[PDB]
Amino acid sequence: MKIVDVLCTPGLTGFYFDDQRAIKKGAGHDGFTYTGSTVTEGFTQVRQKGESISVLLVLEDGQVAHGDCAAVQYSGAGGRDPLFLAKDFIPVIEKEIAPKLIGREITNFKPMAEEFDKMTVNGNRLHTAIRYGITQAILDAVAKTRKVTMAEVIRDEYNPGAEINAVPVFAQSGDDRYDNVDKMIIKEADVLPHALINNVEEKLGLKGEKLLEYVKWLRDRIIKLRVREDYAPIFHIDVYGTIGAAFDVDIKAMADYIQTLAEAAKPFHLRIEGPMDVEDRQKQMEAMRDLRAELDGRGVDAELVADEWCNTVEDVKFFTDNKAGHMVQIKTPDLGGVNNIADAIMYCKANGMGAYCGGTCNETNRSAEVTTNIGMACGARQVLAKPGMGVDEGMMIVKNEMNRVLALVGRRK
Amino acid sequence: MKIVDVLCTPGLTGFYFDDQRAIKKGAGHDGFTYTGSTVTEGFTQVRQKGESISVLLVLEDGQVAHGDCAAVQYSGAGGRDPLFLAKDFIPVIEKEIAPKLIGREITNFKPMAEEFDKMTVNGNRLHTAIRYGITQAILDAVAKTRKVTMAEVIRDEYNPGAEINAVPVFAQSGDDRYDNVDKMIIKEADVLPHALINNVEEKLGLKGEKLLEYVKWLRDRIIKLRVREDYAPIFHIDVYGTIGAAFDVDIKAMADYIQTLAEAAKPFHLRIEGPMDVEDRQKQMEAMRDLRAELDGRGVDAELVADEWCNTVEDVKFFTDNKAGHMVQIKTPDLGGVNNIADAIMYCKANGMGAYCGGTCNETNRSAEVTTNIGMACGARQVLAKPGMGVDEGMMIVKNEMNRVLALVGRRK
Numbered sequence: 001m002k003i004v005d006v007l008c009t010p011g012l013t014g015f016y017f018d019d020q021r022a023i024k025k026g027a028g029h030d031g032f033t034y035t036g037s038t039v040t041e042g043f044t045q046v047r048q049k050g051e052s053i054s055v056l057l058v059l060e061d062g063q064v065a066h067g068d069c070a071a072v073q074y075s076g077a078g079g080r081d082p083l084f085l086a087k088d089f090i091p092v093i094e095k096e097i098a099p100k101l102i103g104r105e106i107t108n109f110k111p112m113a114e115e116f117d118k119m120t121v122n123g124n125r126l127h128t129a130i131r132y133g134i135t136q137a138i139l140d141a142v143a144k145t146r147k148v149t150m151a152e153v154i155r156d157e158y159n160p161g162a163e164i165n166a167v168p169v170f171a172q173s174g175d176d177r178y179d180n181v182d183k184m185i186i187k188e189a190d191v192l193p194h195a196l197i198n199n200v201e202e203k204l205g206l207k208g209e210k211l212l213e214y215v216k217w218l219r220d221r222i223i224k225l226r227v228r229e230d231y232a233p234i235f236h237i238d239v240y241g242t243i244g245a246a247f248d249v250d251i252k253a254m255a256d257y258i259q260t261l262a263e264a265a266k267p268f269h270l271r272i273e274g275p276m277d278v279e280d281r282q283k284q285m286e287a288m289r290d291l292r293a294e295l296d297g298r299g300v301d302a303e304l305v306a307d308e309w310c311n312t313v314e315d316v317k318f319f320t321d322n323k324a325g326h327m328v329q330i331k332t333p334d335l336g337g338v339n340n341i342a343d344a345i346m347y348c349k350a351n352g353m354g355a356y357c358g359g360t361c362n363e364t365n366r367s368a369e370v371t372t373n374i375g376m377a378c379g380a381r382q383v384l385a386k387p388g389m390g391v392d393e394g395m396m397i398v399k400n401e402m403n404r405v406l407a408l409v410g411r412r413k
Numbered sequence: 414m415k416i417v418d419v420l421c422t423p424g425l426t427g428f429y430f431d432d433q434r435a436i437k438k439g440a441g442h443d444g445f446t447y448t449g450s451t452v453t454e455g456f457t458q459v460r461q462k463g464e465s466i467s468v469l470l471v472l473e474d475g476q477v478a479h480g481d482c483a484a485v486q487y488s489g490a491g492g493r494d495p496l497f498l499a500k501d502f503i504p505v506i507e508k509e510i511a512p513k514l515i516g517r518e519i520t521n522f523k524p525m526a527e528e529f530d531k532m533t534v535n536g537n538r539l540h541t542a543i544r545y546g547i548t549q550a551i552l553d554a555v556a557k558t559r560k561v562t563m564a565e566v567i568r569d570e571y572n573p574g575a576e577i578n579a580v581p582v583f584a585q586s587g588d589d590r591y592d593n594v595d596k597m598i599i600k601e602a603d604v605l606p607h608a609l610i611n612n613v614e615e616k617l618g619l620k621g622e623k624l625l626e627y628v629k630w631l632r633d634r635i636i637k638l639r640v641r642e643d644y645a646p647i648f649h650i651d652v653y654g655t656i657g658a659a660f661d662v663d664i665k666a667m668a669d670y671i672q673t674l675a676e677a678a679k680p681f682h683l684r685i686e687g688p689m690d691v692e693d694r695q696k697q698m699e700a701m702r703d704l705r706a707e708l709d710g711r712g713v714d715a716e717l718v719a720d721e722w723c724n725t726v727e728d729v730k731f732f733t734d735n736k737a738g739h740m741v742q743i744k745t746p747d748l749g750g751v752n753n754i755a756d757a758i759m760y761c762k763a764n765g766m767g768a769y770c771g772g773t774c775n776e777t778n779r780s781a782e783v784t785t786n787i788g789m790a791c792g793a794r795q796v797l798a799k800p801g802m803g804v805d806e807g808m809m810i811v812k813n814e815m816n817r818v819l820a821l822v823g824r825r826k
Contacts, residue, residue, distance in 0.1 A: 005824065007817075007820040007823075007824070008820075009813075009816040009817055009819070009820045010816065011809070011812065011813035011816055012805070012808055012809040012812050012813060013805075013809060014803075014805050014806055014809060015805055016599070031591060031592050031594075031595045031634075032593075032596055032599075033595055033599070033638060044640060045599075045640065047599065048599060048640070049599050049600045049601075052813070054813060054816065054817050054820075056817060056820065056821065058821075058824070061560070062560025063476070063557075063560070064821065066817070068813075144476075147474070147475025147476070178444055179444045179445045180445075181444075182444040182445035182446050183445050186429065186446065186458075186460065186461065186462050187425060187462050188462075225446055227457065227458060227461070364809060365778055365806075365810055365813075366813075387806070387809075388801075388803050388805050388806040388809075389803060389805070390427075390801045390802060390803020390804075390805065390806050391803075392425070392426070392427050392428055392463075392800075392801050392802070392803065393427055393778070393800070393801040393803055393806035393807075394806075395425055396424070396425040396426060396427060396777060396778060396800075396801075397778055399424065399425050400422075400424040400425060400465065400467060400481075400777065400778070400779075403422040403423065403424060404420075404422055404467050404469060404479070406422070407420045407421075407422045407467075407469065408420065408469065408471075408477065411418065411420070411471070
């Protein structure tokens with residue numbers, strides 16, 4: 001079965017491109033918009049629409065494979081490829097990638113994904129977002145040629161012999177950490193609620209007091225609102241290094257604190273993401289490793305999730321090999337080729353590290369469907385409800401995909 | 414081509430099932446939930462998760478056709494079929510519908526859709542939500558058999574010889590009528606922002622003064638925020654009969670007031686939905702017709718959108734034949750079979766009336782994709798960005814689908 005044509009179309013995403021440099025310089029607020037000059041190349045407004053590119057691969061039998069190129073909210077920020085505007089990147093795909101796809105016979109997913117993940121143009125690697133979209137599309141093409149699910153393809157090629165099962169769905173709140181929690185409990189999210197604890201003063205509490213009360217509140221809210229007694233979700237709070245800042249990165253003080261959180265969450269289990277945020281990758285790994293070791297020795301079952309300084313596949317292995325935390329966030333759009341996702345999840349698993357198949361609020365419904373399939377195939381510890389900040393829609397997209405995938409796999413199981 | 418298997422899975426939606434009777438009787442609004450006893454049959458809480466049923470048709474060639482059964486937010490309310498719990502209706506599809514689909518030949522969409530839309534069980538018609546989802550799956554099966562888009566199937570069978578072009582996308586704000594407008598301007602919604610003006614006191618003003626001030630605020634906000642000078646969207650405000658209530662259904666008074674709105678929206682064109690909401694269908698038709706005649710005779714170029722008492726295809730005909738408004742809301746999930754959307758749009762087109770192909774915040778990503786294809790195929794005046802209240806997600810689902818559909822038709826154009 002060959003690819004016979006390739007089409008690219010601009011699109012929207014679940015959120016916005018935001019000029020992080022400008023917002024850190026002091027951009028003020030005006031309704032949903034930000035005021036002031038932009039600072040980052042390519043931005044025309046501090047907040048502007050997110051963009052995506054749909055890549056369609058028409059197959060010789062008439063079927064259409066579909067992937068979505070997309071980037072994080074802080075596109076073009078320090079360390080990222082340039083602002084992902086459809087108009088700047090559609091020409092690259094049409095001129096440089098399409099001619100290498102048309103006429104190609106559809107093989108196994110892995111060799112083709114790897115080729116496209118690493119391909120260069122004028123000696124330079126392609127934007128992460130282009131690699132993300134093209135590889136999704138290749139995955140969909142392989143699945144449609146074989147007449148199986150994406151999940152099945154990945155499982156065959158990366159996790160052979162494994163059962164494909166439901167994966168816990170994690171939902172994120174933004175700053176709207178009380179009302180969005182209610183939505184999560186009514187829809188029975190398996191993991192919640194992120195809570196965006198990104199300010200020491202206003203959100204953690206200078207001494208961690210506010211987050212302590214929030215955990216207590218969350219605990220109570222779940223018991224009060226849950227439809228069924230046996231809904232027992234996992235708490236996962238992202239603290240953006242604030243625990244480090246509030247406690248001077250003192251391993252001891254950080255552990256004592258986290259221990260009170262875990263006590264407060266009882267009966268629910270607690271995952272804390274990004275407790276500290278240090279200056280180098282090496283020192284980040286060191287702190288996460290040693291904090292895990294201290295919690296682990298005291299028999300405090302609270303888990304740490306690595307995120308800060310862990311971006312690439314190499315980093316995922318760096319953190320995994322050093323047991324620097326209990327779980328790793330796999331930042332899907334940032335890894336480029338979706339084959340990297342599967343490799344990262346299987347690597348984490350081989351070393352006993354829980355893989356959090358993440359993503360961004362600024363990607364799409366299609367890209368969420370594709371990574372959901374990857375996370376299920378590799379036995380990820382959890383997957384992110386995405387895209388968007390509405391909560392409902394991201395939970396819908398990911399859960400409904402999961403259920404359908406399980407149904408179809410069941411017919412062959 | 415035959416269907417060789419049928420699978421059903423339960424699912425989520427873009428929103429909630431709300432016990433509207435309980436809310437009116439005094440349920441407590443507490444964060445995103447409602448406390449208090451239920452009043453409507455089937456509900457176990459006043460606010461509960463919206464539900465869907467994904468219907469998959471596995472074709473002989475291994476492709477999978479996909480539709481989603483879904484219902485409105487006020488499922489089970491006055492005039493609707495019972496609360497749409499997947500656990501209650503999956504058995505119904507499995508025992509009563511599936512066996513009529515397995516082994517069935519795929520031919521033309523229309524006869525097949527009509528069959529399943531009208532089918533009975535124990536002499537009773539199928540729940541609307543079931544007819545919605547099963548006919549979308551059928552449309553998908555015909556498209557995949559022919560190796561064309563859903564839109565092309567509909568165009569061939571209902572609008573033969575016509576071009577398939579983009580349609581304007583309408584975004585709804587809920588009560589967040591200021592910050593959601595900013596989202597809509599950033600993403601250049603073609604038509605906005607609904608504004609939920611559902612209270613005479615709080616929202617319209619006893620003399621229409623609050624809505625007057627909101628129209629001026631919107632006009633200015635667009636001008637302040639837009640990226641391009643020639644972004645010029647249409648205003649579409651749903652007033653839920655409040656203009657009739659506030660002006661005693663006086664045709665002249667209503668028109669003079671609407672004229673003031675039009676003057677304040679300038680230079681944006683204004684559509685007003687549900688200006689009055691009277692005691693019977695006949696008298697609703699009469700007032701909508703009469704209010705249009707007055708506006709048209711005065712040269713006031715503001716349009717009226719028929720909603721209230723316009724429900725079925727017969728209702729659509731009725732309002733159309735009497736010129737009762739300028740445009741009609743086609744409330745997709747309510748019509749059951751999606752073939753009825755097509756028939757309703759083409760009737761409007763045959764008779765000088767614009768068709769607003771709507772939906773509900775409580776549908777799914779798939780149901781949205783499917784009805785968007787129908788809208789485009791039939792040349793609807795606008796389609797609703799749906800589902801969800803996040804705004805971003807609903808705009809993304811509908812506009813991205815649109816663009817992809819256009820690129821595919823483009824290859825055969």
